[PDB]
């Protein structure tokens, strides 16, 4: 039943939006809970922090859903089957980051004059190739 | 201004990215902690927590810049502007996105999928309504 094949489907595609909604509604709401914290609201910041708890749920079932219809990671379009699997996906997303998408990002807001946030680019840039090298050495583990 | 610029929708890209990442990772953990792999599971779990602190950086600009929530298009300057945002995502999550997703899921002949769907615009719901009350006593003084 949860095993049926969703390839090909509206429903696959659906799927992949919900997780990334899901992922941005706990950050959001996170950050939020934040402002709620400096300004003295521990209700609000601490009703924040549980309906975020409850957009960690949605968005792992969204990726219960994913893996058991035999459907790739939203993010890398990897197959998260196995936990090796999953290490090569999370290598796979974080290797975009520190090749491609962070050096093209600080490229871009140095050339429309944001030196600020491209230094920012930068450190995250460095911060991914960090991370996709931590990965490499577990998955060397792993296999 | 950062307002109709290429890093606008730059920080935009990176935060969507930044929020599954953090999302991956810890569900990654669970399989992990399962296996008996904890120094795996910590490094998730570490990384994870240097996610959040990227989306909340790209967060912090696009609020420095003038700019919109990525989930909302609504502003997020204020924590009443930022309780709004909730309330407008949740609503069009409940009222649209969940339901047609539960309907193409029915339609597709997934059940389960639509069943699961159902079950989160009824969540939504809640969600909007709960911030519905923050916001009165917010506006309210
Ligand atoms: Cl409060
Ligand atoms: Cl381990
Ligand atoms: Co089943
Ligand atoms: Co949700
Ligand atoms: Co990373
Ligand atoms: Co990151
Ligand atoms: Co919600």
Known sequence: GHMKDL?????????????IGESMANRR??????????????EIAGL???????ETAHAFGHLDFIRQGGLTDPATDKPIGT???MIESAIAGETYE???????????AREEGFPEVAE???????????H??????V???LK
Not at 120 to 130: G, I, M, N, P, V
Not at 132 to 137: D, H, L, P, T
């Open 7 to 19: 390839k090909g489907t509206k429903t696959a595609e659906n799927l992949k939006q919900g997780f």
């Open 29 to 42: 709401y996170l950050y939020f809970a934040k402002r709620a914290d400096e300004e003295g609201y521990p």
């Open 48 to 54: 924040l922090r549980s309906i975020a708890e409850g």
């Open 83 to 85: 936990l090796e699997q």
């Open 98 to 108: 520190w090749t491609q998408m962070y050096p093209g990002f600080a490229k871009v």
């Open 120 to 130: 920012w680019f930068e450190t995250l840039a460095r911060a991914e190739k960090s």
């Open 132 to 137: 996709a090298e931590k990965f490499q050495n």
């Open 139 to 141: 998955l060397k583990q």
